[PDB]
Amino acid sequence: MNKTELIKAIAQDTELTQVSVSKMLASFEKITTETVAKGDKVQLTGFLNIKPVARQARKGFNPQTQEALEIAPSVGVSVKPGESLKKAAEGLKYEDFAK
Amino acid sequence: MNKTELIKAIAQDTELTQVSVSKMLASFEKITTETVAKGDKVQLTGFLNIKPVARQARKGFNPQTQEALEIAPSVGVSVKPGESLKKAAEGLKYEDFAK
């Protein structure tokens, strides 16, 4: 789902075994966190075009998810991949997608 | 930009030198293709949550309406990263998003 997914996956080529792969996971935490915080705006080999946002300290969810929402340390990230990924989604889970 | 970004940046810890990362680039082509195509629905260790949006629509009625009719190889990958990436976006994009 997460560590199983890409520590296994990418170890197939790079990350060959436990030591290389384990670096990779702890190294993508470092790939972005530098970017998102200051350098957020990015494109990553047709795999990750990062474009995030805040919305400051409004703090006041609603009248339901008790005094909350995710608003005081920014808001989230909005990202677009494609090209490679794009051609992929074409034909394999897709006939359930247009009907 | 694409190659220079990943190869150097992520090589700092994992991807030691050209051999290591270089596998990781040609392999990220092989990381998604499987998923995006059929398994598109996915989360990437709190980095990349994939979810496709198929949209071409065109079977092939005849050389007339425009060879098409109904549903086709359709897609552009839509992705939302997670609280870890935007946890970093609580700093500097956090700020000037404001206006």
**Is A5 exposed, middle or buried, given 0-12, 13-18 or 19+ CB atoms closer than 10 A?**
middle
Q: In a 3-state reduction of DSSP, which class is residue A77? A: strand
Chain B residues with CB under 8 Å of A5 CB are 42-45
- Please state how this structure was obtained: NMR
Angle subtended at Cα A18 by Cα B31 and Cα A24, rounded to the nearest 5 degrees: 50
Chain B residues with CB under 8 Å of A17 CB are none
CB half-sphere exposure, A2, CA atoms < 13 A: 9
Residue among A14, A77, A88 minimizing CB distance to B24: A14
Chain A residues with CB under 8 Å of B29 CB are 84
SS (H, E, C) B41-79: CEEECCCEEEEECCCCCCCCCCCCCCCCCCCCCCCCEEE
Helix H or strand E segment including A53 = strand A49-53
Q: Is B44 in contact with A97 (CB distance < 8 Å)?
A: no
Rounded to an integer, what distance in angstroms lies between the CA atom of residue B59 and that of residue B17?
47
Pairing mode, if any, of strands B77-80 and A49-53?
unpaired
Chain A residues with CB under 8 Å of B92 CB are 37-38, 40
Q: Is B45 in contact with A2 (CB distance < 8 Å)?
A: yes
B39 CA: distance to closest CA in chain A (Å): 7
Chain A interface disruption, residue of B93, B95, B97, B99, most A CBs within 10 A: B93
Q: Is B92 in contact with A33 (CB distance < 8 Å)?
A: no
With CB atoms and an 8 Å threshold, state whether A85 touches B39.
no
Q: Domains for chain A: give ranges and CATH numbers.
A: 1-99 (4.10.520.10)
Closest of A56, A37, A35, A75 to residue B98, by C-alpha: A56
- For residue B80, the one-letter residue type is K
B63 CA: distance to closest CA in chain A (Å): 22
Residue among A35, A38, A82 minimizing CB distance to B76: A82
